[PDB]
Each structure stands twice: as C-alpha cells, then as structure tokens.
Symmetry: D2
Subunit: 344 residues, 4 copies
C-alpha cells in the first residue's frame, strides 16, 4: 500500500487504459446489481436467481470472438467472484477472450442536503481496500457513476451539484490509481426534461471543465484514466428533434473544448437511447472530426436488451443470443471508428 | 431540506452547548486510545471497566454547572453503568447533552506527503438518525492538517479536501437532527513559529467557512473546534501566553462570522494548566461575538484518571478533581480565571 | 508592497474612526454626469461654480462632524476651492471630517453575459491613491454592481467571481498606498424578486467577497463594507415589514462578515430619506453586532438639502439645517435609537 | 455587441487557424520603447523613432518572409507608423501576406503582500483600444503575464496564479468581443536553480488554472492561441537535461492541460539562444502527434543575429534580411518536427 504513484505503476495504468481505448473496441457494461438485473429479467419473464445470473453472464462471456470488439467488461462484485455453470471463473472466461475485467466500486446515490433532490455518489469509505481486493481477483479498471440533472426553471445543475460531482469523482479516481485500477470517470448528465440540445451542450461543457480541473487538483494521471460522459442531446421531452449530425457535432465540440489529449479514451454512456440510436450517434460523433482520444462506447442496455430478449431464459437460445451480441458489438466497433456499414 | 423547526432545534441546542461559562467534556476515546491510559493505572481495558470509569465521570455532582455537552464514542452511547443505569440517562440527570463521534478515521490522500482525509460520509445520515434516537444532539468529526514550511504543507489539496468534507459532514448532520462540531485541527507538530501558525490558521478557516456557505450549513446550528494559535512543538521560541491569546483571537475575528454561537477549542498536547491559561488569555484580550470555550478530553481527565487509579475508593476524590478542572475552565471561558503583531 | 506595522496601524485607526459609533459617511462623490441629473431635477445649471457653491455649503455646515466621520468626494472636488478660495479638503478638516475619494472609473459590460458588469480603474490605481493621499484623502470608494434575475440565473457565477476578484485587488492596492478601502458590492433592487431571494443572493455574494479579500491579504481591520440592505425588489408585490428588512439584513451580515471588520456602512439605493433611516434603525435594533452598522448615504442625505438650496446662497442657512436634521436622524438610526424566516 | 455572434466567432477561428498554419509561426516585434532600448544598446544603436522605424522596415520588407511567418506582433507605435519610404508598416506586412498583431497590455506591477510577484495591467479602456487597433489592420493581440518559480519561497503563490488566470481570461474575452484573436501568454520565468521536474509541475498547474478561467469567462478556444514557456530547468540549475527531455516534458504538459479545440501553441523562447529555441521546438514536435500546431512566437530568437548584422546601417539591410530568412526557415521546419514516457 504506497501513497505516491511510482513510474512503474503509472505505466501499468497507462498501458491498461490505452488497451481499453484500443481503436475499434469498447466496453460491455455488465455491472447490473441484483436490484437492477431484477428489472431487466422481469422484462423478459426470467426469475432472478443467482443461477440465472450466472447462466446469463456465462453466455455473454463465452461469446466466441467477442474480444475482437470488446476491450473491457465492467462487472458487479458478485460476478467478479463468480463461477460459470461449468466451474470456470467469470474472470477466466474474460481473459480467454482477451477482455480486461472491470468492477463497479461506487455504493449508490444519496440526496445532497438543501438541494432540490440533487445527488452525491457514495463509496469512498473503504475504497482503497475494495480496490486492492478487486485487483487481486483480476479487475484492472473501475467505474463510479455521478449523476446531474438539467432543469432550467430550477437552475439545475446547481453549483453545489457540480462541485460535489467534481470533487468526489476526483477522489475516487485518485484512490483507484493508488490501488492499481484505471478509473472510468462518469459524470452523467441525465437527459430528463424538455431542455434543448443547446442547453445540454452548455451544461456538458461547464461540467467537464470542472471535472477536469478537479482531476488536476487531485493529481489524477489522465494517461491512466477514461471518461464516460453523456452525449450532447436534447432532453427526452424536448419537442425539437435535432439531426444525429448535430448530436455528433456538439458532442465532439464539447469534448474538444474540455478534454486534454493525454486522456486515452472517451467511452460514451447511451442512457435511454435505443440500440440503433446509440450506435448511429457514436458513428456521427466520430465522423465529424479528427480527435486525439478514442471515441467509443461503454454500453449496457444498448448491447444487451435484444440479447436478453433472445435468450429468454433458456440455454437452447444461447447460441442465438451470442450472435445478437456479436452483431451489436460489431456495429458499435464500426461506429467507434466512424465507419458504420461549425456552430460556435 | 432544512425546515424552520429543525433549524430552530439546531440553533437552540448549539446555543445551549455554547452557554456562557460552559464547555464540552470529550469522553470519546476509542478502545485503542483508552488502552495506554488504563495501562498506566493498572486497569484492564474491558467494556465493563470503561463503563465503570465513565460512570464515575457522569455521576459527578454538579458537573452540569460547567459542562454543557459530553462527546461519546458509540459504545458509550448505548452502554449501561455497573448498576444498570444507561450512561445517556446519567448525562441527562446532570443536565448535559450527549454528543457522538461520527467520523471513521483518517486515511492518506494520494500523491501528498502523508496528508490526510477523514472518512465516514457513507451511511452517515443513518448513523445520525440512530444516534439522535438514542439521545445524541450533537456530533463530532475531526480533520487534520500539518504545517511544514519546506514541504509547503498544508497543501492546497489538503485544505480543499478538509473544507469540502467538513462541509458535507456538517450538512448531513443538520439534515438529521444533530449539531455538527466542525473541527479542522492544525497540528502543532514541527518547529514553525507562532506567526506561521497564525497565517495557516486564518487561511484554513477562510476556506472552511466558505465551504460551509457553499454547502448551506446553518452556522446558527453549528460550532467550531479549532486549534489555538501557538508555536510548533519543536520551535525554540516560547511566546508569552498573552501572545497566544492575542493571535488566536485575531485569527478567529478575521474569519469566523458572528452567526456561529461558539468556538470550543481543542487543547492538543497542552498541559491541563496551559489549556486553561491560554483559554483565559484568549477571552481576556477582546470582546467576541461567539463564546470562546473548551472541548477538552485529556485536559479535563488526566488528573482524574490518575486520582481514581482503578479503584472505587478514590472515585469521590476523582470527581472532586474533575470539578476543579471543569470550574477553572468555566472561569477561563469567561476570561475570569482565579516590531509588533498587526491588530 | 508588503503592509508594514505602521501603515497597518494607520489604516485600522482611520477605519475605526470612520466607523465611530453614532457617525456615518456623507457620499458627495457624484460625477459630472450624475450631478447633472440631481441639478436638473431642481432647475439649476450644472456649472463648476454651481458645484463648488453647492459642495461648499454642505462642507461648512456647523457641527456636521458630530454626525459625519467621512465624506466621499469626486476627483474634481478633492482639488477644488470653495467660492472664497479655501480648499474643499480644508473645509472638511475644519469640520473634523476625513476626506475620501472615489477611485473607480465606472462600469463596462462583461462579455457573453446578459448585460452584467465589471468595474474599471485598476490601471494606475496605486499612483492615483498616492496623489489623493497627498491631497488629504484617507479612504477610498469603488462600486461594483450585481443584478438579481431568477429566470436568467443572475447574478451569474462570472458576475460574482469578477466582482469579488476585482474588489479584492482594489482593496489591496488602496491599503498598500495609504487609503482605507470601502468595499462596495451593490446588489441592485431592480426586478420583482422577493426579500428571501435578496437575502440568499446577498449572503452568497458576501461569502465570495470576504473569501477573495482573504485570498488577496486585505486587512479587514483597515477596511469597510458598503453593502445593499436586504429588501424585496422594486417591482415585488410583497411589502415586508421594516422589522423584516432589519432582521434579514442583520442575518445576512452575521452569517458572512468577520468581526475584525470595523464597520458596515450601508448604501440606500432608491429608498426615500425616511425609509433609509427607518431601515438602518431596524437593522440595529434587532441584535447586538460586532461591527458598526451605519450609513454611507448620498441621495438620502442630500435630496431635500438640494431642493431647499434651489440654487441660491440666500437659502444656504436653510439647506444646512436640513442637512443637520437628516445627518442627526441617521446618526440615531446607526445606534438603534431613532410560517417564518430562519434564524 | 456583447454576445459573440456566429459570424464574429467564425472570423476569430479562421484568423487563429491561419496564424497556426502548419509550418508557420509568429515574429514577435512588439518590444516597447524601453525594451528596444536594451536591444539597440547591445549593437550601439541610438533609440530614436527613426531607428525603430528603419529597423522594423527592414524586417517587414524581407522578401518571402510570409512563407514562414503567419503573423507579426507589433507595439502600438509601429502599428501606426510609416516606414522611411512613406508606406505604412501594416501595408508592408500585408504585402508579405502576414497578419498584423498588437500588444495590448500596459506592463507589470507588483501584487501587494507578495514577494515581488506581478500583475499585468491594461484592462481599462481595452475594448476601445482593440477597436482602434482592428480598424488599423490588427487581427490578433498579445498580453504577457509573468510568474516566478522559487521553491524556498513557495513561488508561484496561489495569489500569483489566481491573478494571472483571471486577468488573462478577462483580456481574452474582451479581445474576442472586439474582433481580435487573443494570444494568452502565461510566461513562467526560467530564473533560479530549480529542476526541469519543478518546471513541469508548475507549468501543468498554471495551465490547468488558465484553461479553467478561460472556460469560466466564456473564451472561445477556437479563436485563441496559447504562448507558454517550454518546460526547462532553471537558468542556474546545474543539471542540463537532454533536448529530448525538454521535448517530451513540454509536449506532456500541454497534452495534459490544453483542449484540442485550441488551434495553436506558439512558444516563447525566453533566454534561449537562437539555436536552442529551434532545436527544442523540433524535439517538442518530434516526440508525439498533437491536435494543435506547435510553433513559435519568437522575438530575440528571430532577431539577435539580425540586429548584430544590421549594426545600425542601411548598407547591411540585405545581409540582415538573409539572416532573418535563415532563422525563420529553420523555425518553420522545427514547427513541423522536420529540422534539417515519464509519468
């Protein structure tokens, strides 16, 4: 347990972060907790037993050739320590595909006092010890989700929300790096509400400027980190649908205006977007310019909805489910290279 | 989401704790801190012996004349004395508010030279609710900063982390019914001058109070527990107690808004006597808009423990010594104990 | 460049003098374009002779120094002679009143804001302060302006940041060159926001201002603040009690202003002569406070004086009596002797 | 107009990208009267307006200079000056295809209560000067801020950095409002005996602060340029690092802090020789692919030998111009990494 980051440990983080950011690859977010996976399984009539969770994840992680398109897979703690039905460790299934295991290390959201229901992410207590344990089990990257809301009538996100988001993300990132894990820094601005794409662009640029200043103040090594931001879109209830081209351009611009080139990758979240839109948008983001970091994906639902539906709880559909995962992984791989087959 | 009635309860309790002539007894030593002290009087460090010792403190007749609050460790808040009475009921019978330590300890900040962060925000609201239900009405959380001129400590990062985390802790406490004691302790370690301590103390407090504002902490329902301004432990200079009084007063006057009802000093490694004398001098040198009092552990208990010496034969004598130290610190809190520095 | 003990001592003595109990500041520092307006309203031609006459009548009011500790001038007046050839500065000395000087050069818009503003005048400020000190000035004034608009999120972060940073630079430069800075972050009462919103904004803005003053090493002991009172907006249909303005102003200040600051000298804005006085009185009555709570009034001390003079020396005596009446009542207000809001 | 329009943003972005054109850099010819004095003293030339006009005319009539030079920064005198044959200096630059630029700062003053750290002046009336300069043909501006490293005195102080970042951001925003691309120059001096590692750490901290401020002030990075120091050891440091190390650490500092939307980073060379300024630029470009141009804005490094060759005689003008072209050429090749990891 050492406090100052050494050249050798910085190097391992940098190499791992660059690997995860490999051109044409992205992240499979398979890190649903027991409560979250309950809803996904409810949607397809499948009972949420530990057995069914092991079966479903083993199907994902034995998808032949998945490693051609997936560089990392974020796990929930259960799955990181779990074996598949045939006795193989989940981590060893990932290794066999050439996929780095990752681990969700946050403990969920609580309300910030004297805000209108804005939130803080918990989990700093014991984080170093959890990181050490996860590293020893084979995890090489981590994930922590902060959440911000846009509400123009209520002046959201508040200063206090942004300040809390930035400080706490920076602490988590510094602690990860101290204990061998590449942090994925995730400041998710929700798309809830009826604000325009212009308001999202303005909010996203301010938020990211604060987040990167904080990472600098906390001595986070950007070479050994990744960003997982929202794309810049209109709100879910906004009546003005911009083109996917405008989403692409304003997302690229927000990032070009705020993200230093030393960061090796930006791995987008898809939020409530459909499988198709999540891919089309990533493609548009990449086509509109040359960028000094990889622009790729860290998708959960946008890689799994159709897969869950196809599996439908039966090993007889395992092969079919795996093919659906490969199609989605493949199209997102192409979208990350801008190859799917100025506003100041 | 702070309501008028919650704000009012906080303000009343904070003003009570800061009552003129009263201060805080800190009885919140962990099993591990208690160990060495019980070793020196030949007493086994068991739960029942800690209850025995603390029951002596909490049945001291008239202690509530000088003590407004007593900070407990969790064990003690839920504990019974040897005769089966709840420790919390003993404090209530004295007219003393129970308080509770809610932090979980110190960890090093990455990429600093051994500078520290205080842990305990995870689950804090729920701990506060449980402690409130058990009778606690104020909380304690300690942050630590170090001075080192050569290494530029305390670093910007130490100060930012300190201010931000204290403010989060203070906000959560207030949301859940407890008055937070905000304690940014600047250690006296090292050989720096009193003037360096003064400059650092003023900077740190400016940062702390700005963060409390940013987090919407109600000052009217909080208290501060700072270091006094003193030279470092290895400093060869020995400033007069009048100078400690003046520079401590100046540092607080320059930084602490008058809406805060009380400043309850920590004593650090100061002797029982010096802790009282410094407090007196701080109060003597000026009029102040907040109470300037004490929140003392060892500076109220060292001679008490030594007098008790592990035996109930000496309990009444030990109580007499506590009353003497409690009284002299009460008097000190009212300023009534019985080239040049810029204004 | 580094504040010496004697320089620091002179600043602190002069700031305490300006804040002397029962005294306030006459703001007589209307620029040419501003006094045009006041003179228009009473049919008087804006010539320099008329300005010299009018100001010389103010500054020869017998006994004015009993109520007025300081008088802020415009540059013209600081170097001007009254009609009989006496220097205006010497008239003020004969009254026992310290001269002060407005040292800002006006407002310009901050780019990419909705018409929010920055105050200009830092270029050559040290050399202006030196020249003004030599001519007799011992305090300075600089006005920053902020607006409240909840829908547009005014005042913006950029407005607050620019206001705080620039006021701190000005303050520090004044102190380096012998002048006590009056720090004036004026939040306008324009618009229809509630008094609660004004309270909240005023507290945020003062927290940012005092933090910046700390960051720039401004000596609070040798400075003064000139804030808005906390009032509802001009177009707000609430009409809170004068007691509420008193309570919320006192609260905002108690929550943010360290006691080392010797005085808070309010601006009156668009308030009437009587309301400016009544509000000051209520602010003082509702609590004890560690700084003077007094006045730095222009219109509120002069509108009736000007209307009585009406451009004729035959009314000089009458005009002076009116000035003494308004100075007196404000002197008395400064001593407080003329479901619910959170404590 | 106060809000930057799409068309005016577009003009700034096009001009900034042009200045950053691959293989081109900036001739910094913006020496003030007092600075050019010193340069002329080295070659025994009298500092008269005629000599300044003569020398600059020789620079600006160098045949083919615009193949290597995209922009030339002028001092105000020169912007409004005629060369000896009656042509405007600005027209000489236009004939070369070079954009005229203008220095808009008014020099350095000390920040109070620092150890001789400095603030850059010139915000007062900047908008109006920018307009007048634009009308005269200028399309970009420059403002120099200065920071010092001194590990024993903890320089650069927080105050130095805060002041530097805030004031640069104000200047940049005002330039953009009035049609000029701002060169943002936070120069960290190489004075002292600190290591290259200390310079790396300080540079990264300063740049992080500067870019956050630029964001807070709504500065359009697409229409701006950066002029930073290279990362080098101090002038009196006894360890000489490899040119490759300067290359790498400079790239790394920028990669860690400068968003890609900025089109160009145009280095200052400080005390470096003509050769070292070029070699270092080449190494910076060679060590990586970068999303902004890495080029030069050189004064002495493009001019020392030119001045020495000229020697105050028009009969050496052609020889002087050939020297300029040689140095312009080599720096052009260096800006493409074509001269002919530490975490």
């Amino acid at each position: 347990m050492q406090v100052k980051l050494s050249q050798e440990r910085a190097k391992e983080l940098a190499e791992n972060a660059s690997f995860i950011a490999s051109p044409g690859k992205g992240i499979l977010a398979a890190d649903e907790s027991t409560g979250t996976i309950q809803k996904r399984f409810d949607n397809v009539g499948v009972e949420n037993t530990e057995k069914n969770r092991a079966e479903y994840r083993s199907i994902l992680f034995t998808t032949k050739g998945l490693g051609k398109y997936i560089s990392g897979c974020i796990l929930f703690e259960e799955t990181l320590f779990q074996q598949a039905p045939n006795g193989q460790n989940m981590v060893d299934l990932l290794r066999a595909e050439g996929i780095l295991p990752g681990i969700k290390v946050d403990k969920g959201l609580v309300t910030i006092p004297n805000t209108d229901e804005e939130v803080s992410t918990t989990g700093l207590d014991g984080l170093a010890e959890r990181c050490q344990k996860y590293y020893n089990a084979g995890a090489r990257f981590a994930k922590w989700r902060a959440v911000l809301s846009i509400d123009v009538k209520k002046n959201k996100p508040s200063n206090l929300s942004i300040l809390e988001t930035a400080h706490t993300l920076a602490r988590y990132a510094a602690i990860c790096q101290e204990n061998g894990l590449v942090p994925i820094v995730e400041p998710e601005i929700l798309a809830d509400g009826d604000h325009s794409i212009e308001v999202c662009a303005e909010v996203t640029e301010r938020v990211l400027a604060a987040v990167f200043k904080a990472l600098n103040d906390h001595k986070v090594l950007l070479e050994g980190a990744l960003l997982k931001p929202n794309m810049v879109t209109q709100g879910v209830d906004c009546k003005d649908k911009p083109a996917p081209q405008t989403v692409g351009f304003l997302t690229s611009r927000a990032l070009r205006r705020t993200v230093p080139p030393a960061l090796p990758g930006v791995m987008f979240l898809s939020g409530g977007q459909s499988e198709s839109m999540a891919t089309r948008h990533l493609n548009e983001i990449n086509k509109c310019n040359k960028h000094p970091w990889s622009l790729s994906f860290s998708y959960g639902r946008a890689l799994q909805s159709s897969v869950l539906k196809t599996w439908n709880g039966s090993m007889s559909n395992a092969a079919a489910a795996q093919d659906v995962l490969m199609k989605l992984a493949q199209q997102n791989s192409e979208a990350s290279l801008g190859s799917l087959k100025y506003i100041y």
